[PDB]
Structure 1
């Protein structure tokens, strides 16, 4: 679509699909582009994703944390698994959801190849997810481990109360 090109001028990135390497490459490239345009101005990352690959999600995570600009995260529909992980990873005080957004932190995948899955288990990237979520939500590692194994769906309000977002955007 020609629309996502216009939105880059507004420093808006839409993450509206399952997260695989292709998507990760696209989002990362968009993040580096906007940093090159203007290293100071905020970026707006709208999220409607059911999740996906963990190494691909970490690629985006790492790029959000590395670049100079504050990356604002705004969930518009769903944020599950890596979707919700990236939602929580946005700039402090600047993580949002619309009132009818659905958030799940269950971390179960996502067209991941042999090499990726091998890396995940060997470098125990799941423990790294749990540890990062714990830091960014304030929850204990033990509560994070428990909830990421479970299939709990949170309303926007329940997501704020959990510490995944900062503010529910009520009209």
Structure 2
């Protein structure tokens, strides 16, 4: 159940959106990406200076859909804080690592996986074709290298491997900036 809040009736997610909070709590597909892109564009229109908070609990998904969110985060004027709760895998971790520098977080028991799987599924027919022709893996690897400070050689080895990181190991890797302290 998703409850209602009256200030004017909003659902829980709508009420959080009023406080510049966006929840990315599922697999990344085109519908999810279009919704997140629209919420990011809307928050910038409301206030171009105030920070945005993107909570991440995602097993990942479509590279195309993830790149649409990634590009929107980088395009907009507001700083987008990324907070991992639960899990950030595949495009999920890519989006976590893509938050404003110094504003990338994860709760103590959060699990981070940088493995970028070969195919999709979710990604469509046309989507998988572009990934390999346009060498989008190399683009993902290059961006991860820039955002973590790790060499491209190290990123290439790690994105190709099934590896799970704790929030502390993710911080040491350069994916997040701080492990959220109970306060």
What's the TM-score bracket when you normalise by the shorter of the two chains?
A: over 0.9
* Equivalent residues, number: 170
**Deviating runs (4+, > 4 A) in structure 1?**
none
- 1: CA distance, partners of 2:123 / 2:54: 24
Following TM superposition, by how much is the alpha carbon of 1:170 offset from its aligned partner in structure 2, in angstroms? 1.5
Instruction: Give how far 1:111 is off.
Output: 2.7
Q: Which runs of 5+ in 1 are unaligned?
A: none
CA–CA separation in structure 2 for the residues paired with 1:33 and 1:157: 33
- Distance in 1 (CA, whole Å) between partners of 2:122 and 2:149 is 31
Q: Distance in 2 between matches of 1:113 and 1:46?
A: 26
The root-mean-square deviation of aligned C-alpha atoms, in Å, is 0.8
Distance 1:11 1:165 in 2: 20
Offset at residue 93 of structure 1 (A) = 0.3
Which of structures 1 and 2 has the bigger CA Rg?
2
1:1-60: CA deviation from partner (whole Å, max 9, x where unpaired): 811100111000000000000000010000000000000000000000000000100000
Any unmatched runs of 5+ in structure 2?
A: 1-9
Report SS of the residue matched to 1:128.
helix
* TM-score normalised over the length of structure 2: 0.91
CA–CA distance in 1 between the matches of 2:39 and 2:116?
26
1:133 equivalent in structure 2? 144
Q: SS at the partner of 1:76?
A: strand
2:94 to 62, 85, 89: 85
TM (normalized to structure 1)? 0.98
Q: Which residue is equivalent to 1:62? A: 71
Once the two structures are TM-superposed, the CA of residue 115 in structure 1 deviates from its matched residue by 1.1
